[PDB]
Amino acid sequence: ARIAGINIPDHKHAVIALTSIYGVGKTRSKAILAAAGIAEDVKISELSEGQIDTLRDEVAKFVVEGDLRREISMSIKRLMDLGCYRGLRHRRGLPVRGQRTKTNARTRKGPRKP
């Protein structure tokens, strides 16, 4: 439960409760569980602290919660420091990955306040 400083759920099959990490989707979830070597749909509650330790030294290979936090931080700050098209889209709150804007792209756009 406690692994990576986060508090993944109990009675939720491990192959999915592993994915609760900000830095591990299903890919790293399945990969770490295979590298450690435990059955698939076991609930996290049935996993001992030594199993948590194996998972700990295994996720110590992938990027983790705070690692990915600082990584995305440094990447966007890199785009900024460059001050490119991507960085300016970022800083001004617009789509970045090359989409249309006039009507759609509401996530990058914001709400309809004015």
Rounded distance between C-alpha atoms, residue 19 and residue 42, angstroms:
14
Tokens of 53: 């330790």
* Stretch 63-102 residues interacting with RNA (CB under 7 A): 68, 71-72, 75-76, 78-79, 84-86, 90, 92, 94-102
DSSP 63: -
Q: Is 19 annotated as a binding residue?
A: yes
* Stretch 8-67 residues interacting with other proteins (CB under 8 A): none
Least separation, in Å, of the C-beta of 85 and other proteins? 6
What is the end-to-end Cα distance of the chain in Å, rounded?
45
Residues 14 and 33: beta-carbon distance below 8 Å: yes
Helix axes 49-59, 26-36, angle to 10 degrees: 120
Residue from 43, 40, 29, 62 nearest 1 by CA = 43
The item of RNA, other proteins, none sharing an interface with residue 16, based on CB under 5 to 8 Å by kind, is RNA
Rounded distance between C-alpha atoms, residue 110 and residue 84, angstroms:
22
Q: What is the size of the binding site for RNA (CB under 7 A)?
A: 46
Q: Is 25 in the site for RNA (CB under 7 A)?
A: yes
- Binding other proteins (rule: CB under 8 A), the pick from 84, 91, 104, 109 is 84
Our CB check for other proteins shows the closer of 10 and 81 to be 81
Q: Which residues are annotated as a binding site?
A: 19, 21, 24
**Where do contacts with RNA occur on this chain (CB under 7 A)?**
11-13, 16, 19-29, 41, 68, 71-72, 75-76, 78-79, 84-86, 90, 92, 94-103, 105, 107-110, 112-114
